[PDB]
Structure formats: C-alpha cells, structure tokens
Amino acid sequence: QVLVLDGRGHLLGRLAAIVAKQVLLGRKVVVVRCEGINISGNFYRNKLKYLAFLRKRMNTNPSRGPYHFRAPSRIFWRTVRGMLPHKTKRGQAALERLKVLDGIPPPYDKKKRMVVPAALKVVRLKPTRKFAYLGRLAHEVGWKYQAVTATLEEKRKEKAKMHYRKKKQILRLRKQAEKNVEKKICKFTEVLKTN
Amino acid sequence: SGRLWCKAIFAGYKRGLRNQREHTALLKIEGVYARDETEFYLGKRCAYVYKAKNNTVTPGGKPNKTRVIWGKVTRAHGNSGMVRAKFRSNLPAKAIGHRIRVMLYPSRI
Amino acid sequence: AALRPLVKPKIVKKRTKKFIRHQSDRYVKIKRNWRKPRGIDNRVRRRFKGQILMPNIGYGSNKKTKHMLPSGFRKFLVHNVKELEVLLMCNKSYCAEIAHNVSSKNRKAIVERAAQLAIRVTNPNARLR
Amino acid sequence: VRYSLDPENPTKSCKSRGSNLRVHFKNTRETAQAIKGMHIRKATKYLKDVTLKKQCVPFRRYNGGVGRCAQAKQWGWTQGRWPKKSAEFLLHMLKNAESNAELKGLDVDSLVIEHIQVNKAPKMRRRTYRAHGRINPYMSSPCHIEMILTEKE
Amino acid sequence: TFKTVFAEHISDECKRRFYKNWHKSKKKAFTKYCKKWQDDTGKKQLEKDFNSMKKYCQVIRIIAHTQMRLLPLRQKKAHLMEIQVNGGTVAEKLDWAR
RNA sequence: AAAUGGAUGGCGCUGGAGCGUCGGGCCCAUACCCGGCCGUCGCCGGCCUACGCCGCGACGAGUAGGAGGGCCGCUGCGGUGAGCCUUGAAGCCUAGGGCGCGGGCCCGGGUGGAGCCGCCGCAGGUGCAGAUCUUGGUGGUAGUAGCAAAUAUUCAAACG
RNA sequence: AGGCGGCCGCCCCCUCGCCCGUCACGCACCGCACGUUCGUGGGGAACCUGGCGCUAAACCAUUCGUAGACGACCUGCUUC
Ligand SMILES: [Mg+2]
Ligand SMILES: [Mg+2]
Ligand SMILES: [Mg+2]
Ligand SMILES: [Mg+2]
Ligand SMILES: [Mg+2]
Ligand SMILES: [Mg+2]
Ligand SMILES: [Mg+2]
Ligand SMILES: [Mg+2]
Ligand SMILES: [Mg+2]
Ligand SMILES: [Mg+2]
Ligand SMILES: [Mg+2]
Ligand SMILES: [Mg+2]
Ligand SMILES: [Mg+2]
Ligand SMILES: [Mg+2]
Ligand SMILES: [Mg+2]
Ligand SMILES: [Mg+2]
Ligand SMILES: [Mg+2]
Ligand SMILES: [Mg+2]
Ligand SMILES: [Mg+2]
Ligand SMILES: [Mg+2]
Secondary structure, three states: OOEEEEEEEEEEEHHHHHHHHOOOOOOOEEOOOOOHEEEOOOOHHHHHHHHHHHOOOOOOOOOOOOOOOOOOHHHHHHHHHHHHHOOOHHHHHHHHOOOOOOOOOHHHHHOOOOHHHHHHHHOOOOOOEEEEEHHHHHHHHOOOOOHHHHHHHHHHHHHHHHHHHHHHHHHHHHHHHHHHHHOOOOHHHHHOOOO | OOOOOEEEEEEEEEEEEOOOOOOEEEEEEEEOOHHHHHHHOOEEEEEEEEEEEEOOOOOOOOOOEEEEEEEEEEEEEEOOOOEEEEOOOOOOOOOOOOEEOOOOOOOOO | OOOOOOOOOOOOOOOOOOOOOOOOOOOOOOOOOOOOOOOOHHHHHOOOOOOOOOOOOHHOOOOOOOOOOOOOEEEEEEOOOOOOOOHOOOOEEEEEEOOOOHHHHHHHHHHHHHHHHOOOOOOOOOOOO | OOOOOOOHHHHEEEEEEEEEEEOOHHHHHHHHHOOOOOEHHHHHHHHHHOOOOOEEEEEEOOOOOOOEHHHHHHHHHEOOOOOOHHHHHHHHHHHHHHHHHHHHHOOOEEEEEEEOOOOOOOOEEEEEEEEOOOEEHHHHHHHHEEEEEEEEO | OOOOOOOOOHHHHHHHOOOOOOOOOOOOOOOOOOHHHHHHHHHHHHHHHHHHHHHHHHOOOEEEOOOOOHOOOOOOOOEEEEEOOOOOHHHHHHHHHH
C-alpha cells in the first residue's frame, strides 16, 4: 500500500510533481535516499539560487518567519509542500502521506525501491548539460551529517552485496534444478501459453 | 470468494477553476491510463461504501454499519484514462482521495 | 390506514431553502424575513458569486403542484361544522384544517363530522388527554 | 420557589438559596465553580482554608489582570485568588444547607454539592466625582445564589 | 543515547538528585537496579549490554557527581554531569571507565 | 545602481514546464442547441368566478426613475360570516409539521388569563438598519485603572 | 528509526495437505445491493477465572536566597 521511491538520479521538480500528484490520490509515498536527487543547471547557479532564498527573511523577527531547512530530505519536502495545497485541510492531511528520509533506514532497506522514469536525469537532460547534487548542495550550506550518511550508506551497500550474492547463488541452484529435472515435468502448457 | 470489482479513486468533482459542479464526479480507475481503454467501463455501476455508527438494514443479512452510495459511469474524461460518473446523491467532500468500487453488473462484453 | 387522495405527481421543488435576508446573521435586530437590498455598492444586489441568492419569479413552483401538502391534499381552514360540509364535493383534492382557537369541546364534533363525510384532516387527534 | 435543574430524587435532596446579598458576582462565580462537585466536609474545609489563604480559588472565566498564585497548581491553572467575602458567604449558605438536610432527615456526611448556580442581581448605584465636574456611575454587582445537596450513598 | 549503565552502590548524596522532596520520599531510588549486579543473570545482561555498547556506541561519556559533604555549603545535593572521554579506542575507553 | 525579505502567481523547469512555426486530442461560461418549470408580451380558442378556463410562439440583467399586481402586514368605521372563546381570547417562546419565489401565513406543543379574527368597501399619525437619530436597558473594556498632597502608629482590656 | 526469519535435535501426531481421473452427499433459499479480507483493526470504562511480581512520586504548606514585580528558580528536616 506504499510506494518506496528511490531518490538518486531523479530531478527535483520532475520527481516532486509526480509525488505531489500521487499523494493527493491516497497512495502513501516514501522517498528514500534524498541526498542523490540531481538538480539541473550549474552547481554554482543552484548555490546562488539557494543563497538568494536564504537571504529572504522577516526583518522584525527572523524566528517568526521563513524557516529555511538545510537537510536535502527537508528541501524535497518543502518543494513538494510548495505544490500541495498545504493551507487547506486536504493538503494538511495529505502531507503526512509523504515520508522524505535521508539514507535508507532499517524500515526500508529490505523493501525493493521503485524508479520513476519520467523524472530520471538520463532521459530528462542532455548528456552535455550540467547538474548539481542535492547532497553536496545541502552539505555546503549548514548540513553536517553528510559523513555519517555516506558511512551508513557504505555499510548498507556492503550488506546488500552479500545479500545479492546469496540471492544469485539461490538463482543458480534454481536454474540447475530446472535443468536437472527434465523428465516428469513436461509443462507444454507453460510454453504454449508463454509463461 | 475474491474481489469482484475494480478499484477507483475519487479525485474531485467536475470543476473549472473558480467553480465546482457537485452533480458530476471524476474517477481515476486503476489500470486505465489512456483514452482508448475507458470504453469498457462506460455504463458500469459504482459504489461508494462507508461505515456509520447507526446500523442500517441490508438487502442480505442482519443490519450492519455499512452504508453505500450508488452511481454509474457516464462518459470519459480527458486523455489520461480518467472517467466521469453521476450518483443518485452527490458524493461528500470527505470522500476525496478514497475508493469507489466499480462493479461489473452492467455487462456488454 | 390514511385516506387515499386522488392521483398526485412527484412534487419537485426548485429551491428547498428559505431565502435569508442579507447580513441577518451578524445582527439579531435584523429579522430572517427577506427585504430587497437597495445599496449602491452591495454585493447581493449585483449578484456576485458566492453570495446569498435573491428570490425572483424563476423559483416559482409548478402550477399543477402548487399549494399541495406532502400527503397530496390542499389545506382549507375551518372553524365550525357549518364550514366543514362545504368541502364535501372536494374531499379528494382538498382537506380540512381546524383553526387554533377552536375549543376541545367543539373540535371533537368537527372531527366526527369529517370522519362521517370522509374528509381528510391535517391535524387529527389533537389536544387529547 | 423556582429552581434550575431540579433533583430527580426530592426525598434525598435539600435546597438552599440566597437573594440580594452583597458580594462580587465574578468572585462568587469562581468560588462556586471551584466548590461544585464536592462533599460538605471537604467544601467546608476548603472554604475555611481559602479564608486563611491556604489554597487558591482558580480564576478561569473572569481573570482579567488577576495575579497568579503558587497554590493554583492543584487546579491545573495558573491564576488564583482568595475571595474571603464570597468564601464566608458560601460557608453561611452551606450552614443553612446542612440545617435543611438535618430537618429533612438526611445524612450530612454523604452529601455532595451536585449543583450550584449564581447569577447577577439588580445593581445598586452611587455617584463618582470625576475631573471637570463630571459624575460617573459607581454600581455594585450583587448576586443570587442557589445550591442543591444530595446524598451520594 | 544508545545505553546507560549505572554503578552498583550509589550513595544517598548522589541519589538526592533524583528527588524533588527528599524528606517526604522513601529513598526508593535504584533499589531494584542494584540487584542486577548481584544476580548472575543480571550480571550477564549487564555484560551483554557492555558488549553491545563496545560495538555500536561511538561517543563514550562518564556520569560523575560532586561531594557536597566535603563542602561548607548546606546544599547536600550532588551535581550530576557527563564528561566525554577522548581516549584512543572506543573499546579501551569503556575499559578505562569500568 | 536603491534602500523591510519576495515575486514568469508559487513550487519549480534546461531530450523543456523557454523562444518561433504548427498537427491530432482534451478541459469549461449565466454563450449556443435539446427538454421541464415560473412570469411578461403577441396571436388567440370556447355560450366556464367571462375579472374565469385553455393552446401556440418569442422573450426574462439593471442604479436614478416611471407604472401594474398583492388571498403581504398594522389600526379604526359601515355590512357580513346564526364566526371563534373561562372545556381557555390577545400576547410570548419553540432541534415540531407544512405552504407561498417573495413580502408573510397555517397547524402542533409550553406559558398566559378576556377578548379576537376571516370576507366586501371605507379612512389612515400604517411597515425601519443606519440620520455623531430621541428615550430606556445591557455588554467587551474589567474585578482593570484607581482608593499615594500635609513625618506615625503600637500594646492591653471592656461592651459586642 | 532493530523483532521477524533460517538452521539442527525432539515434542500430540501426520504419508487424500499438490496435479489428473473416479461413485456418492451437503441452506438446490427459487434473477438481484451494503459479499468475500491484514480484524485475536486503534482508543477508552468495567464484569467471572489461572499463574508470576510491585508496595511510590509530584504539587500545596514551611524554610533557604546562588533567584526573585507576582509566578518561577537554587536548597534542608534524622532524633543523631
Ligand atoms: Mg545555525
Ligand atoms: Mg456603483
Ligand atoms: Mg486579553
Ligand atoms: Mg495585576
Ligand atoms: Mg496594573
Ligand atoms: Mg465643581
Ligand atoms: Mg524563482
Ligand atoms: Mg436568454
Ligand atoms: Mg428586468
Ligand atoms: Mg388580515
Ligand atoms: Mg391556565
Ligand atoms: Mg382581569
Ligand atoms: Mg409614521
Ligand atoms: Mg432599531
Ligand atoms: Mg448615535
Ligand atoms: Mg422605565
Ligand atoms: Mg458598562
Ligand atoms: Mg490593581
Ligand atoms: Mg488625597
Ligand atoms: Mg466578648
């Protein structure tokens, strides 16, 4: 009943629009690994845009004003909130369906991740265009947990490597068993109706 | 046993930008994402099923907390497989983003 | 076992709500009765969207079902037994309604006469102990 | 006479009333709302402690510019006071309630204040001499009080 | 905060910190927690807690309290405070603390 | 290059969600077409309250202003209802039922305790949301400001 | 931001739990809806029964002043 969408390789707005449209329908969406979301344009251009956004702030009381977030997950959350009607009760109720998270936590490392090809940088941008990584962009402005994020990502990748090796061994054994039991299993129906 | 209806979500009523029409509702049925695929669901009955605190009589069995609003598919909507519907009574605004089961009672093929 | 009227169609109402006077909710000195707003810059007079509705001739109900009760009869007010026998020929479409100032002693006589004449009464078995 | 929220068991209930008595209606309302739903002994003890400033009466509805006390934490509120005149008036009313219960033959120990209502009274007037030779009203706010006592067990 | 392991015998001078009213209280703090150091099963549980901390925890801090008895003040309530240990290895910092 | 932080409407968009030329679909106005209902006008139809009863067609916005209808409402008078009422009049209240597009009205229930209303005409000191409107009453402010010009009170007892 | 899954040794037992064929039965409700599901769903007040364990802490009052406009905050009480 949930949609676990990977974050790496997807464009910021191209993915956020799809998530904002899918949340208003009722599907609970969880965007994992938000530090890999790419943004079109020059990295210095995106940095200048983010700094111009940071400059905007209430004069009389900055604490009671625009709350600028530094984590890339919170950046993506604010981007989706900018498209959702958050000032109405429908948008307020839909905002809990979206779960933006940095890294791949225990509740989501075992779940298979989905990829939306309509937001992938490979098909969205030309191979000669410049892009900026949201993780580096956030780390350059008031983000401190990039090192531990990368360390935990390395750990979970080294674990998933062994898991995939085990799965590949199981697949090899399955293919060997299929090739071994040739008799007693005709299954001409499977071939005539093509699996 | 097993489900005998298609799944559809209520996105909103038929509306422009600064006005709504509560008599006609829009449905996003799962599996249909094109205009050439919604011709099968034209005329199919639809049911918005919810629960209340006072049990009401049911056609089969003892009274239950279940209450259903009936309607049917009128025509298609757009090119993205969205469909239209008109119920006996207009859908409540709280049903936006919830499920209306599309039956297969009126069968043509 | 109520008295069956003549044939009756499904009465449809153009508007089921009663028209509310403008700004009658903010001030309790303003009665619920409708008054035509004649302001030079009022929203209701020029019919802005989202405002209250103004009653016009368009909301007029059908002449075939006008003044018809949900039971299917048309009420006629009576005071004594003399003004009850006049509804003898119109018992199938018109029905009787006893006045409010009629005493309980003279009300039961009207009820008995209506039951004898087979005339529908909108307020039967009223003010009984 | 006429009472609001008459008791369902008139044989196990006793009523008390005071009319046109000179206290502040607001302080009387606060102390009555604080004392409602309490046994007679506990109510007497609480009023005797309020008179000596041992535990505040929380001002919830009429609390404009009311200084906060430390003893109001028991009521989950921050603003409390010690209205002595209303305390002694409600004590005098509870005495008449106990007397009526004894006359009716009820158990005083099991009596609880299930209902107590206070409302405004006709205001008496005086005049105040202000600047530039102006006269302003100086009005009192007396209140009518009523209470019903019923045995809990 | 991953885990916290307290000592076996905690003096009342330090236990006074966990109470707002020391006179009305019954001094029942850490009565059942001290039984873990006496029970062999509790000792095994504390040892597995230490073993899990050695592997998972990265920043080690030590909780210490002052001795108001030696001071001329009449407070008698010790101030508990955490001090981060900046030793070489996380595995040896736990040994140095234990 | 301009002074509060900030405006392709915002989010955002770069194999386009930008610019130029275009194609096929799709979205909706009180606009158009079909149909129901209400009113006006025109043409009328019948020897069924003729001031009534039908039929067809076309049109309905509107300040200032001009007309027509009201079986909308208030008071009093002349007729009339063999009118209603101490087995309960007027008045007041009501999560009750219901009518009229509307002004308003009918009934049920609870108070109330002595008059009232329908129809046909007549005459008005006849309909209120305002006028720094008149009189009377009541709220927020608010148990707030304020009980501070001229040195100062304390102990014990009695009547209560 | 961890708790379900795998392995091995037994436990009350088990070779119609799977695919094809075969004789015979059952709410065959007489054309109809809200049917079938993670529901031993979440939350709150109690009722009858078994086994294992628990016997407090806050606020008020009082005191302190490292703090106080009032609240608040820093402190003490033991019969040695
Ligand atoms: Mg900072
Ligand atoms: Mg104008
Ligand atoms: Mg205020
Ligand atoms: Mg004050
Ligand atoms: Mg002040
Ligand atoms: Mg003077
Ligand atoms: Mg911009
Ligand atoms: Mg037109
Ligand atoms: Mg016009
Ligand atoms: Mg009249
Ligand atoms: Mg009476
Ligand atoms: Mg009299
Ligand atoms: Mg006048
Ligand atoms: Mg007025
Ligand atoms: Mg004025
Ligand atoms: Mg007067
Ligand atoms: Mg005033
Ligand atoms: Mg003051
Ligand atoms: Mg003076
Ligand atoms: Mg004396």
